Design a protein around this ligand. Structure first.
Ligand SMILES: NC[C@H]1O[C@H](O[C@H]2[C@H](O)[C@@H](O)[C@H](N)C[C@@H]2N)[C@H](N)[C@@H](O)[C@@H]1O
Ligand code: NI
Length: 282
């Protein structure tokens, strides 16, 4: 019911900021440890978010033409990969120096991005169940994080247009028989948790970047606006967690492969089909 992101969760920047001073970084880490979600305002320029927003709304028709449209949990929550064309792969988005500074500190210098995907929340979408995007490695065990979701809204997220319900501090909870095979939280454990630390939902301005634990409870909620709500989604993992590589064109290999901000990527000659992944050599 907030009119902006809570201060407990938020850290304000300009796009020119390339690192956090030690005091800011310790705070960012302290938030991800305690709350499991960190909102970074003013990270990305309009020039980038605009091109990416345009590119994904242009692709949405090709996505909805598909015989079976891939959704997450309920109708209206479409899985859509953004394009991997030389011209729409920006270093400030894939290899953001502030994001990787936080993820290196949390997951290790060998941590790597292994997801370049998206969530198109359509008008009249349904309520998702509360869930983990990425599960705990064993039931009934406390362990540190092995993955951080990096969510990039491509329009102003509002209460009406489907800003995500987040459950702060839920990333460290992992009792027995808590999660089912799709990673949905059992209803008993929700109501116990709602009493101690209830969910929050808030606007997130475009140009913001949200970093959160992969294990954080959350649910997508109905888009009641007249416009699709695109989200570009990356996920950094520890070196040792097994993931299939991101299909990228060799036209970007030059700067992506060199970097000490690691991507788990496989480079193909020529164009890559993000949408349906039909490209001949995977
Ligand atoms: N790293 C965050 C993302 O993780 C999940 O999606 C993955 C999901 O983990 C896989 O089952 C699927 N094969 C790919 C999909 N993109 C979530 N369902 C997405 O909503 C979220 O964008
Ligand atoms: Ni989710």
């Amino acid at each position: 019911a907030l009119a902006a992101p809570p201060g407990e969760l938020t850290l304000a920047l300009t796009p020119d900021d390339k690192t956090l001073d030690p005091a800011s970084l310790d705070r960012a880490l302290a938030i991800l440890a305690e709350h499991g979600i960190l909102v970074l305002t003013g990270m990305l320029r309009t020039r980038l978010t605009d091109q990416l927003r345009t590119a994904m709304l242009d692709d949405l028709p090709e996505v909805l033409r598909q015989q079976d449209v891939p959704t997450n949990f309920v109708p209206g929550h479409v899985q859509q990969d953004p394009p991997v064309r030389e011209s729409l792969l920006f270093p400030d988005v894939l290899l953001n120096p502030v994001v990787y500074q936080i993820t290196h500190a949390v997951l290790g210098a060998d941590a790597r991005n292994a997801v370049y995907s998206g969530n198109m929340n359509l008008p009249g979408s349904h309520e998702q169940p509360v869930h983990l995007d990425e599960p705990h490695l064993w039931p009934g065990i406390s362990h540190p994080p092995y993955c951080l979701c990096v969510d990039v809204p491509l329009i102003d997220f509002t209460l009406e247009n489907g800003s995500t319900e987040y459950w702060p501090g839920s990333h460290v909870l992992n009792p027995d028989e808590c999660y089912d095979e799709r990673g949905c939280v059992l209803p008993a454990e929700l109501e116990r948790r709602r009493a101690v630390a209830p969910p929050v939902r808030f606007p997130i301005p475009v140009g913001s970047v949200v970093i959160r634990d992969g294990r954080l409870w959350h649910r997508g909620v109905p888009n009641l606006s007249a416009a699709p709500r695109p989200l570009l989604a990356m996920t950094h993992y520890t070196e040792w967690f097994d993931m299939p590589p991101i299909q990228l064109p060799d036209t970007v290999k030059s700067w992506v492969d060199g970097s000490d901000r690691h991507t788990h990527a496989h480079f193909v000659a020529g164009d890559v089909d993000h949408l349906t992944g039909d490209h001949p050599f995977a």
